[PDB]
Each structure stands twice: as structure tokens, then as C-alpha cells.
Ligand binder design. Structure first.
Ligand SMILES: NC(=O)C1=CN([C@@H]2O[C@H](COP(=O)(O)OP(=O)(O)OC[C@H]3O[C@@H](n4cnc5c(N)ncnc54)[C@H](OP(=O)(O)O)[C@@H]3O)[C@@H](O)[C@H]2O)C=CC1
Ligand SMILES: Nc1nc(N)c2c(Sc3ccc(Cl)cc3)cccc2n1
Ligand SMILES: [Ca+2]
Ligand SMILES: [Ca+2]
Ligand SMILES: [Ca+2]
Length: 159
């Protein structure tokens, strides 16, 4: 199945100038745990910001243009990105904004980190219909010495 995984601050803001503003190591550990040993699909902008492939995951990059790095799998359409994953139990869509938008209708699961942070952003997570999704997991955490914001990991499944 297709899943999207994203970290959302106030107003569904996901990014600004191709970087996540906030410092949330607990979200980095949640992201790693839910993505490890699964193919990851990302947009070209997200690919450039990471610099190196995510290890122990097949890295699929969405770009209209020819690929510029042989360490990753390059595709030119949503359907090509899915087909390049082959037969796997779950496909992780990691962003960014435009990629989330396109994969949302095809997705069965959403792994959302809701961050209680006011951030200026130029990129937002899609405006998903809440009636279409069922929250099956929801774990709130207060801010601590390592995480400067309170945050909630949520798992939603398409009804
Ligand atoms: O974060 P945000 O700023 O949203 O950036 P993203 O990380 O979502 O990257 C978006 C980029 O990925 C590529 N892309 C996205 N969707 C498709 C598609 N359906 N077919 C081909 N290429 C696609 C394009 O690269 P490119 O500009 O190379 O087409 C686009 O500019
Ligand atoms: N919970 C969560 N979700 C992601 N998708 C993460 C990523 S990669 C990424 C960032 C923004 C967007 Cl839109 C997509 C992927 C990196 C580091 C931590 C991340 N944490
Ligand atoms: Ca490995
Ligand atoms: Ca739909
Ligand atoms: Ca805060």
C-alpha cells in the first residue's frame, strides 16, 4: 500500500526555503522507524535537500528531467514511481508539498507528526478531507530538554 509520512507545524506548514525550521529529534526517530527497509518516494527538491540517499531504503526520485545521480532510482511520473517499487507491503511517500498532493488520492495511510510550533512556511501538507480518514494511533508528547515543542504522532487510515 501507499503511505504518506510528514511533519506538520501550525497551519499544515511542512517547510520553508527547502529545510524544516524546528529541531525535533523524536520526530527524526519516528521517521526512521516507520521508513526503514521500505522504498521511499520523493520529489527532486526533497532529494537535493537531503544530499545523500537514505540508507537501508530504496530511494525513488520524481523529476520530469533525466536523472543526475546513479545512487538513486529516477522516475518521470507518479505511476512510474509506484511501478519502480515492485511488490512490497508498503510504499513511503516522504515529500515534499507537490509530491504529497499527487500521492494523497492513491494513499491508504498517513503518518502525521503534528508539531505545536508557529512557523513561517512556503510549503504546506495537502488539505485532506478529515471524514475520509480514521485516526487509528495518536500519541501526544510534551516538550522536553531534547524537543523544543510538544508533538503528536498520528496514524490515519482511509475509511
Ligand atoms: O517541497 P516542494 O517544493 O513541493 O518540492 P518537492 O520535493 O515536492 O519536489 C517537486 C519536484 O519533483 C518533481 N516532480 C514532482 N511531481 C512530479 C511528477 N508527477 N512527474 C515528474 N516529476 C515530478 C519535479 O522536479 P522537476 O522540476 O525536475 O520536474 C518537481 O519540481
Ligand atoms: N516525521 C517526519 N516526516 C518526514 N517526512 C521527515 C523527513 S524527510 C521529509 C521532510 C518534509 C517533507 Cl514534505 C517530506 C519529507 C526528514 C526528517 C524528519 C522527518 N520527520
Ligand atoms: Ca542498511
Ligand atoms: Ca480521494
Ligand atoms: Ca511550541
Amino acid at each position: 500500500m501507499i503511505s504518506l509520512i510528514a511533519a506538520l507545524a501550525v497551519d499544515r506548514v511542512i517547510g520553508m526555503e527547502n529545510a524544516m525550521p524546528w529541531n525535533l529529534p523524536a520526530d527524526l526517530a519516528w521517521f526512521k522507524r516507520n521508513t526503514l527497509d521500505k522504498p521511499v518516494i520523493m520529489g527532486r527538491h526533497t532529494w537535493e535537500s537531503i544530499g545523500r540517499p537514505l540508507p537501508g531504503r530504496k530511494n525513488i526520485i520524481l523529476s520530469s528531467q533525466p536523472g543526475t545521480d546513479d545512487r538513486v532510482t529516477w522516475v518521470k511520473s507518479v505511476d512510474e514511481a509506484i511501478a519502480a517499487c515492485g511488490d512490497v507491503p508498503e510504499i513511503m511517500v516522504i515529500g515534499g508539498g507537490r509530491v504529497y498532493e499527487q500521492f494523497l488520492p492513491k494513499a491508504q495511510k498517513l503518518y502525521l507528526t503534528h508539531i505545536d510550533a508557529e512557523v513561517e512556511g512556503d510549503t504546506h501538507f495537502p488539505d485532506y478531507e478529515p471524514d475520509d480518514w480514521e485516526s487509528v494511533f495518536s500519541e501526544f508528547h510534551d516538550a522536553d530538554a531534547q524537543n523544543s515543542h510538544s508533538y503528536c504522532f498520528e496514524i490515519l487510515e482511509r475509511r
